[PDB]
Each structure stands twice: as structure tokens, then as C-alpha cells.
Symmetry: C3
């Protein structure tokens, strides 16, 4: 099935943020048996490999924005790789790597399917612009580079002149928010972007969240969905090995509910599994707990259901 | 005392339905934790019937892959007789396990007295593998297949199960908490049209709506006896770690108590099973006491213990 | 904003219960950066300091009820202190301290706003009377002294002659209940007090629980809201450093939801943060986890929102 036809892309990149180890995300995800598990789940899996992110000397900061040229380039390569996966009729599965990579993954998916909708699962909005940022870390800015409404608000940042804003404010839905900067909250509110912060999740229940999310995105007619999954969207009791963890997060169950629901639309077209950093587990057990959760989430995106699965044969004869 | 709180305790120290030793020590640790005395503090009329003496079968050869077939079959045979006895005395049978294979007997025996019973099966697993579909060969993952009338023809003649006569239809069983269902089992679940609430349905609806829909489904037409078969692995292993087949993403302590509190409120609980408590499977003694304390909290809630409080029919302000 | 105009009262008092260390709740709550964190979120914060509760050495039990004069005098002083804070047009924030202090906090607050409505977040009903109690600890009795319907059922306890019942049974709502004594259950049910035990929270979800809570207390008419928060209302995995923990509690998320919803009424008028005991965790991280959770609850009462917060300026054009 097209909903189980995948193109894996390794994106070992850390320079959208300062904590070392996130570049190991694709490694520890492959080591956990992701591809073998997808194949056992009746998936058509093609491995596009791990992108070779060539190091850039003298990557001077843009104002306080760190490694602009390195971040801009990694996303540039990825956009090209994602568009290749999409032309081949595969669902793109981006193994991160920090969340700056969402610039390249969403941009490449949008060159093939410009009518896509984005579901952004995360404790953070990642919507600071190179001007509103106080950290200078680009993994906190990808949504700003992608939005149509922000065109003219993004300065000419070295490494990013290839970026054509490809998503409108109406086409993104945030799930999981609980650590949004003042400037970010200003942007989310003035752009009227649809969002379910942890407050809305507590208020409505994940069941209603998913119902409204999907009705908002797919009400009119069918269209491709891009799921951008920052693993910090889940509570640090499930995914501790991540660079910016925030307590009171989505549960392991809520993470499976969201992805089980997206799988059932049969419209998942692009997926990012981001911010896994195996150098940040307090114990090797915290690393394994996180990696296991990221794999579970990925498997649900491609059909693994808690109620069970079976081949269309007769199991009693 | 109220029928809702009139109980017949049956201990079932049985482990040959699965490969991990220690589950036969389940009714020992539960009794040691003060279960029978806690129920008496709750205004319960509690009669202990003792622990069933399970005999050894030395030459218990396998039926294909199916392990210890005679041991498991006779175990449940001795339990259906003891359960039918408790039900004739007008008490709620309370089966302390022991592995889930014992459900064959507990439900078989309860069905001999109240054939109109409904079953609520709280487990991470369906336990609906037939001796033919199973890939593990363990009978603790097979009880429901032996109980369903619709699987009459698909169950071979395993040594030790001759007495078994399927007593429930697919319309008379509700699963809550499913999250580790084999392909053979999922086919059986979907072909037979069994009502179920996996972790997906629990997340979607909330435990409030799960219990409203479960109870309406089973009771809504006519009032009937309830058989609750509770596999402690239905709850997440952060609450019941000391179990043979733990599965992450389970029901919480709160959902567990919510489930059992609602069943008590019906006033129709007629049979109960507290299964798969294995005290030799804790990583630490703390993990064992936690599994044991939770199993006790779940049990007490089945017989009236309410989180909002409990009081005797007296004036507490002017006694 | 008046919903962000605060008056801090430290009430370092532990004699409402037997476990030493709860009197450090104000110390440890301040040290976690509370006042600063509040000023950071645009609040106008005044600190009235910690009350000096002078020793009351001759304090014989009233039957089994321990330290009656000490608990009585502490709430009496706090009631005058809260009434002063309310007269200065500031929301009272009482940093506890054991929960017996809510006699004084609710009493003083009622002196200025007698139409107030109570929200009591707790694993316990704290409604035993000096006669129904079996522990004889006054932190488990505050509600009984404050209810008008129990006037006739409260004996003359030394240190409490100043108490006048200020709230009717209809004007209090419980959330989080899971460890209620039989006598307390008999009182709760006989008075028809509105409650949401952990069973109701599981049945409806916190969203519906907060909808019904604010409809029940604000339906007839908008009035001041007094939130009395016992940190043991939240599950011990979030607030372990407390004297009477009970498993199966409110989650960290549910605690924020309650208080975020309370903030958005713009009617929070009084707030108790009670039962933090930094001498009672298993580890120092368990102490810091409790304190941080109490701080988080506190900030959510004064407008910290998980969706985000921003000043009325153009962040794209500074
Ligand atoms: N909004 C931040 C940013 O760096 O722009 C502030 C930082 C402090 N809290 C976490 C950090 C945010 C970045 C989030 C990036 B992430 O994890 O969602 O990919
Ligand atoms: N369906 C199983 C089986 O053994 O039949 C597969 C095994 C691997 N995961 C758990 C095992 C299942 C049986 C569990 C039975 B129990 O624990 O629910 O009583
Ligand atoms: N209801 C109690 C009481 O002391 O009256 C019984 C005691 C045993 N369990 C906990 C104790 C109760 C008081 C708790 C007061 B608290 O924590 O909410 O301040
Ligand atoms: Mn994030
Ligand atoms: Mn992110
Ligand atoms: Mn079972
Ligand atoms: Mn099971
Ligand atoms: Mn209290
Ligand atoms: Mn309490």
C-alpha cells in the first residue's frame, strides 16, 4: 500500500542547536531495528542512506544566529533528497538530527505536493525568526523560514537564499505546546495558527484533539499530511534523551494515539522523527527508553495498531 | 451483608499455563498483604474456601507445541467445580491466581450456575489463541478460544480439556486494555465481531466513556451476572511490574480503580479473577509490594471501596 | 492587572500535624525564585514577610485534639493578616505551613469578601470535627470550623472562640479527593457539598471538572474565588515532599489546568499553597521536584500559560 511505501533518509546533523549527540539520532534509530521492524509490518522500505553533511569552515554567526551556513546547507540537501523520495512515490521518513532540518524536509515535500498540511508535534512552536530569537539556535526557527505570511519578516540569512516559503498559516496545526517564547506566542497569535497546547489536550482529550486536527486539515477534501515529530513533545519520563525537555508532556499513549489516527487517514506523505540525542540519557536505560518510544511512534505512523494487525489471509484454516 | 459484598475466596496456586515460575505464589502474597481482613473492614461477608491442592502430572507430554496440556486442563477442572460450589452458596467467587489459563475453569464453573453471565476481560492481551493458532504453546494465552461457542469446530481435542463445553458467545465478552494482540488473535477478534476497547479506544474516549459503553453493551438489554477476569498486566508495568508478560502503555492505577468501582456500582458483580501476579518477577522487593498493593486496591474496589469515601449506616455527628 | 496584584504571606506553622518540617514551606518556596518568577510574569508583588507565631507552651490537648491554642492563635493572626492584604486590594498568597491555617486564611478573606467561593484541591476533605476526628490533628479539620451548617456540631475548643463560620456548604467545591475518613464521608454526603473525587476526575476528565466547578460557583453570580491548594492533591510522583501522600493523584498537567482555568476567571482573590514539607522527601531531588511543582502551580494562578505569554508590543518591530 502507498501508506506503507517508505523512503528512509538519515539526517545526522546537530548544528541547529548546541548539545552534542543529536547527530547520532539516525544511528541509534537504525541500531534499534527500525527498518527491519517496518519490513516485518508489510512495509516497502527503501533506504536512501545517511546524508553526508560536509563541514563548513568559518561559519560565522548571522548576528547571534549560530552556524547559519551549515544549517542552511543541511536543509538544502535534505529538501533535494525529500523531493527525490516523493517523486519515487514514497513517504519520506526523515531520521534526525535537530529540528532545523524541518526547513529542508517540509520544503522538499512541498516542491512535489504544494497542497500539503503540517501537523507539528512538539513542546515548542519553533517559530522564532532570525530576529526574534534570544538563543540564536536555528532548531527554534524552522517554521519561520517556511511560512508564507512571514515573507518579508525573515532577513537575508547566509545559507538560506534557496528557501521559498511554502506553507500558509492556515495549513499548520501544533500539538503538544508548553514552552513558547514571548515573541513566538506573539507570532502564533497574530498569524491565527491552529494549535492544541497541553492546556487544550487536558481540556478536550487527545481523541477530540485528533478529531478537530484532522477535520481542520482535511475538511474540504483529501490532501497530503506532513507530520513533524519532535520527540520532546512527549513527556521526559518517556523520551528523556532530548536536548530541550519540558515536564508535563504528552504521554506515550497520546503519542501512539496521534500517530495511529494519522495512519488511518491514509494520507501521511512526509514524516520527521526529531531531537533524539543518545548522549543525553541519564542512564543507558534512559537512552533505550527514548529510542524505543521513537520507534513505537514511527511504527504507528506506518500501520502498527494497538488493537492488533493481520495479513488478509484466513488464520483459522 | 449485601450480596454485592458477599464473597467466596478461592486460591489457585497454578503456574503450568506459562513458562515463568512464581505465579503459583500469587494467592500467598495477596493473603499475606491482608486482603481478606481489608474486605472485612469494608463490611464484607468473607468466607475463605482455601487454596486448591494441585497435583503433579509427570508424563504430561505436549499436544503439538501446546505445553503442559493435562496439568492446565485438570487445574481448571478442579477450579470450575470449586467456583460452581461458591456460586450455589450465593457468594461472589474471588479467584486469586495463578496464570490466566485458570479463566477456563473460573468462567466454566460460574457459567454452570449463571449461564446468562457477561464477561469483562481486563488485559493487555486477548488470550484467544486456539491450540492451533498459538505460536508460543502457552495455554495462558488461550482461555477465551476454549470458552466461545463460535469457535466450536476450530478447537482440537487437547488432552485434559474433554469436560470443557463453550459457555459464552462472542456477544457476551468485552475486552478492555488491549495493546499486544497476535495476528492470529486479531483475525479471531475481528471475524467474531467481539466488542473491545484497546488502549486506542481508551485514549480516544476516556475510561468514563469506556465503562459507560461496556456496561450499556452487556447490561442495557436485561440485567445479568458479571464476570470480571482481571490480568494485572492490563495496568501499565509502572503499577504492576511483577508479571510475566508486561507491556508498556497500559491502563493507569486510576483507570484500574475507575473500572472496578463502576463494576461494583452495577451491584451485579458475580465472579472475579485476580490473575498473573508473579512475586518472583520484581526487579526489587519494592516492585513486588507495588504489584501486590495495586492488585489489592483493585480487588477492594470490586467490593465497595470508593475513593470518595465509605461510611456505615449510622449518624457520625451524633452517634 | 488586579489578577496579577499579589500580597505574600508566609505562615511558617507546623502544629496542625505531627510531622516536623512543614514550617519551612515558606523558606523553600521563596528560595526557588517564586517572587522573582512572579515579577518576571509582570505581577505587582508585595511581600508582607513571615508571621511571627510566638511560642504557646501551655497547650494541653482538647480531648484527642493536639495543640489547640497554637493552631487557634496562628489562624487568628493569619486571619487579621489576610484581611489587611485584602483591604490593600491585593490577592492574598499564603505560603504554608500545614492546612489548619486555612481556618485563618478563609476567615480573614471572608471579612473583606463574605460572598467568596472556595475551591479546595486536596486528596483529603479536611472536614473532621474535633469530635469526629480519630487522629486529633487540626490540619484534618479546617473545613468543619468554617461551615455554617456545622454550627451546633463544633465544641468549644481552646484558641478558637474568635472563629465564626463564614461559608455555606453550597459555596465550596472539592477536587482530588481519594482518602476520606468515614465520618468525613458521612458529613460530605449529608451536607450535599459539591465534590469531584479521583473517580469523577477519571469519569469526566479535568476539562469537564473545571467547567462544572466554575459553573457551580459562578452560575448564580460572579464572586471572589479562594483557592486552597494542598500539594498532596497532586500525585506523590510530582509532590512527594508532603506529610500525607496518597497514590493515584492529580497529574502535574491536571494541576496546571485547574489553576490556568482559575486564572482566566479573573476572580482569584485568595490563594493557599499548603503542606510542602522539605524535611519529608526520600531524596533532595524529591524536595526540589515538590517545590518546583508548587512554584509551577503558583505561577499558573497569576497568569503563566502553557500556550505562551507576551507583552502588548510588536515582537516583529521592537
Ligand atoms: N524557543 C527556544 C529557542 O531556542 O528559540 C528557547 C529555548 C529555551 N527552551 C527551549 C528552547 C527553544 C527551542 C526549541 C527547539 B526544539 O526543541 O523544539 O526543536
Ligand atoms: N499471545 C501470546 C501467547 O503466548 O499466546 C504471545 C506471547 C508474547 N507476548 C505475551 C504472550 C501472549 C500471551 C499472554 C497471556 B497473558 O499474560 O495475558 O495471560
Ligand atoms: N483525615 C485524616 C485526619 O487526620 O483527619 C486521617 C489521617 C490519616 N490519613 C491522612 C490523615 C487525614 C488528614 C489530612 C490533612 B491534610 O493533608 O489534607 O492536610
Ligand atoms: Mn521541541
Ligand atoms: Mn522542535
Ligand atoms: Mn491474560
Ligand atoms: Mn495479559
Ligand atoms: Mn489538606
Ligand atoms: Mn491533604
Amino acid at each position: 500500500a502507498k501508506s506503507r511505501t517508505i523512503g528512509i533518509i538519515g539526517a545526522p546533523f546537530s548544528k541547529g542547536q548546541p548539545r552534542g549527540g543529536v547527530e547520532e539520532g539516525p544511528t541509534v534509530l537504525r541500531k534499534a531495528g527500525l527498518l527491519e521492524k517496518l519490513k516485518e509490518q508489510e512495509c516497502d522500505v527503501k533506504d536512501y542512506g545517511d546524508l553526508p553533511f560536509a563541514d563548513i569552515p568559518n561559519d560565522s554567526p548571522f548576528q547571534i544566529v549560530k552556524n547559519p551556513r551549515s544549517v542552511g546547507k543541511a536543509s538544502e540537501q535534505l529538501a533535494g533528497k525529500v523531493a527525490e523520495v516523493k517523486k519515487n512515490g514514497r513517504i519520506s521518513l526523515v531520521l534526525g538530527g535537530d529540528h532545523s532540518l524541518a526547513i529542508g524536509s517540509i520544503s522538499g515535500h512541498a516542491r512535489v505536493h504544494p497542497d500539503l498540511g503540517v501537523i507539528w508535534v512538539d513542546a515548542h512552536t519553533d517559530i522564532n525568526t532570525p530576529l526574534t530569537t534570544t538563543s540564536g539556535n536555528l532548531h527554534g526557527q524552522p517554521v519561520s523560514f517556511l511560512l508564507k505570511e512571514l515573507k518579508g519578516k525573515i532577513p537575508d540569512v547566509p545559507g538560506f537564499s534557496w528557501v521559498t516559503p511554502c506553507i500558509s498559516a492556515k495549513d499548520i496545526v501544533y500539538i503538544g505546546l508548553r514552552d513558547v517564547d514571548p515573541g513566538e506566542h506573539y507570532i502564533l497569535k497574530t498569524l491565527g495558527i491552529k494549535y492544541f497546547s497541553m492546556t487544550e489536550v487536558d481540556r478536550l482529550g487527545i481523541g477530540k484533539v485528533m478529531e478537530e486536527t484532522l477535520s481542520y486539515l482535511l475538511g474540504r477534501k483529501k490532501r497530503p499530511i506532513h507530520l513533524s515529530f519532535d520527540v520532546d513533545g512527549l513527556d521526559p519520563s518517556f523520551t528523556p534523551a532530548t536536548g530541550t525537555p519540558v515536564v508535563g508532556g504528552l504521554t506515550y499513549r497520546e503519542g501512539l494515539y496521534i500517530t495511529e489516527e494519522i495512519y488511518k487517514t491514509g494520507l501521511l506523505s512526509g514524516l520527521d522523527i526529531m531531537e533524539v540525542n543518545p548522549s543525553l540519557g541519564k542512564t543507558p536505560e534512559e537512552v533505550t527508553r527514548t529510542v524505543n518510544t521513537a520507534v513505537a511512534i514511527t511504527l504507528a505512523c506506518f500501520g502498527l495498531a494497538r488493537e492488533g494487525n493481520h495479513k488478509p489471509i484466513d488464520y483459522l484454516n
